[PDB]
Amino acid sequence: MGDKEESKKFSANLNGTEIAITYVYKGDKVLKQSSETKIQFASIGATTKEDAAKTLEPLSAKYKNIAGVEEKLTYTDTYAQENVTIDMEKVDFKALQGISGINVSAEDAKKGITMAQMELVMKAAGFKEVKLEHHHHHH
């Protein structure tokens, strides 16, 4: 019935990395996990984009072809935004355990991410959801 596939976007600013995951779920199943990690320089140990890539490539190359896992390293000089898109319709959870891990709950990451899981599990992770709204602060 049209069936809205809805985006749930949380954003945790930790370790110097701004991780905002926009995961789209349809029904009770999450289907696309947009894990957009805004990494800042200096904190990563990189002073230049070259040195940054030499640190990032090894990690971003882990996704490779696990599934519909898109790795967009967008970096100018001041920051490196790793826009990740994990497709949960072809996911291999074998390799994923050594990639993204998602070791917040072994039940979630190993058995297949479910909306009930991602919800309770991201709440358990202590992350703050922004939904998709930033102007939520009326006054």
UniProtKB/Swiss-Prot annotation:
Coiled-coil spans in chain: none
Membrane topology of this protein: Lipid-anchor
Subcellular location field: Cell membrane
Listed GO CC annotations: plasma membrane
Main location: membrane
Keywords: Cell membrane, Lipoprotein, Membrane, Palmitate, Signal
Similarity-based family: To L.monocytogenes lmo0207.
Protein name: Uncharacterized lipoprotein YehR
Originating organism: Escherichia coli (strain K12)
